[PDB]
Ligand binder design. Sequence first.
Ligand SMILES: *[C@@](O)(c1nc2ccccc2s1)[C@H](C[C@@H]1CCCNC1=O)NC(=O)[C@@H]1Cc2ccc(F)cc2CN1C(=O)[C@@H](NC(=O)C(F)(F)F)C(C)(C)C
Ligand SMILES: *[C@@](O)(c1nc2ccccc2s1)[C@H](C[C@@H]1CCCNC1=O)NC(=O)[C@@H]1Cc2ccc(F)cc2CN1C(=O)[C@@H](NC(=O)C(F)(F)F)C(C)(C)C
Lengths: 306, 306
Amino acid sequence: SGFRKMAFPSGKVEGCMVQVTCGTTTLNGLWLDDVVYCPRHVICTSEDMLNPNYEDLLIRKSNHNFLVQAGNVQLRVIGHSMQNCVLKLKVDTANPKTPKYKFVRIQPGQTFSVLACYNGSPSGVYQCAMRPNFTIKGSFLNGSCGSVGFNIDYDCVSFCYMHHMELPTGVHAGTDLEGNFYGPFFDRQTAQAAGTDTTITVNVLAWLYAAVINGDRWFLNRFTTTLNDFNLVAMKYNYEPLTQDHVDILGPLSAQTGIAVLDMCASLKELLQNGMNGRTILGSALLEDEFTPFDVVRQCSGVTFQ
Amino acid sequence: SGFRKMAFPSGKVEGCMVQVTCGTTTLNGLWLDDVVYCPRHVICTSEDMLNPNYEDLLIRKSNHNFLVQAGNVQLRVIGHSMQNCVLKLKVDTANPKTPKYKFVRIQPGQTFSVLACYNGSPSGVYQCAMRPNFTIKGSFLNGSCGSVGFNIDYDCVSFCYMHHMELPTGVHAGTDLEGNFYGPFFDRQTAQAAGTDTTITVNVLAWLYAAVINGDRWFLNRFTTTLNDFNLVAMKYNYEPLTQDHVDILGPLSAQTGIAVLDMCASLKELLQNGMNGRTILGSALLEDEFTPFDVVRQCSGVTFQ
Ligand SMILES: *[C@@](O)(c1nc2ccccc2s1)[C@H](C[C@@H]1CCCNC1=O)NC(=O)[C@@H]1Cc2ccc(F)cc2CN1C(=O)[C@@H](NC(=O)C(F)(F)F)C(C)(C)C
Ligand SMILES: *[C@@](O)(c1nc2ccccc2s1)[C@H](C[C@@H]1CCCNC1=O)NC(=O)[C@@H]1Cc2ccc(F)cc2CN1C(=O)[C@@H](NC(=O)C(F)(F)F)C(C)(C)C
């Protein structure tokens, strides 16, 4: 029993974190085989931090203008290239701790673990989600850029995020590991700002199923709803539309609990319209939307506490 | 910016997790140097799971009745001893991944990271607190016993918890790494139940300071309170008394924000008496009490967003 914001064990990623320096700029890099991946703005100086032309800045650099430190070992850079907003530094040593890995570009609504790092050294691990507006509600300070987000499946690390920027609302923007930003953001100091965000409906439903698995039914009701009528309420509360594919994805949790998806939708409708009346669900007074259906299955018992 | 339930990176602990089998019972163990630590009830069978006499059960075992598996490598047991509720198995191989480490018995109110493990294999990492009633609100299924809790300081792992039991309310009980339970609990199937819990006041105050550091002041007021008058309100809301030592511990966060501790106490008093009026603090609609003052300093900027 219990239900926690649960991150993946971070060891396989810790062994990949390094420090990249160019000029007086240092940030984190990810060392896999003989390549170190890091945000390309490591090549910016104090005077470049507005609207840099990265191709023009990078052609002025040589391999030896980059320093890569792995622990107390300096790795020599023997090639470099820019791919989108990521710099790839070829180094003379293959990381002996390279895990089995993939790069994935995730969809909004999906969750991942972040290994927050400073000076190439891991500091902490937490769970977040790719928001519908393609920001993340991270926890990042100066020096964190290059920290990565990941999921793990049967000892394969799927990297999905590299940290680049903090937006004016205090949320975060970054890239996939091929250097493409999530959302409409850029690695430049310009007017960018999160678009209006929405609540991830399929995830709230998954978390309600988690609450039932763990023995709590107080929020259920005798009603059902059509998908169309539910979505008319969702829209009013700034929730994402629920699709039939979401309904299908929730199939297993519905089967394990004996509660039809559209019946859980009617419970959620009532919660939106009435509030919680001072009660909590899985220790929260808000409707939590950063657990996916997979996250619930991963953490919860396959046996419902009936 | 941001503020997350942040666990320590778990790599140094992952490398210590092993599987211990006795009879048909398998659970997790912690391999440090040439010793494997695990819950002593690994020696129980289906018929022992009520009121076992552990000294009588253990004298009937030999070293070769214990199997220790580290990955796909079987470690041979060459000695055993019981210390309180923990079994110590001496093995023929010292763990080459043994980190620098300590065993600590923590005080209630302190937080730690849990590496949840099944079959000797790490599954996830989350943050919890030792509750005033010496339970933890963990997330544990069958097969999790022997999973450990820890803090890390300058690459020294301080182990503080080993998981043993789930109580009827779904919360968890366990031991320090010397095998002494936290709280009044036993490794036996008897009427035990969590005592009444309380909210960790000094931690709520620390988290309010975190909210101010990150730029949010909506809950502050112009009032102050005496320590005695605050504690009369605390008692009414099932909060722990706040001591002068708590006040002292909050000194640094008070100094960084310019808000006197007893002024923050008056803010907390008002929150308790009025509620939040539908507003949130650091993304929560409840007063969070599982961040210590140290946790806030560790995660937050040393520069307040004024
Ligand atoms: C990251 O650690 C980096 N620092 C540096 C320093 C020098 C060169 C390159 C980098 S990357 C930080 C993390 C960030 C810091 C603030 C606290 N919380 C965080 O997550 N990233 C930045 O500072 C980025 C990098 C950058 C790159 C090119 C530019 F032209 C400008 C920047 C500045 N920057 C920002 O995040 C800024 N935000 C924005 O410009 C915007 F539009 F996204 F809001 C800033 C105002 C500095 C937060
Ligand atoms: C842990 O994984 C262990 N399983 C076994 C199995 C055989 C032998 C030894 C152990 S340790 C579980 C973790 C637990 C399971 C339930 C779901 N969530 C969890 O955290 N620990 C137990 O099952 C313990 C072990 C034990 C030891 C000696 C005994 F005499 C009896 C037990 C049973 N047990 C419990 O946690 C039970 N709770 C209580 O007895 C009490 F009083 F604490 F509530 C149980 C009712 C099984 C949850």
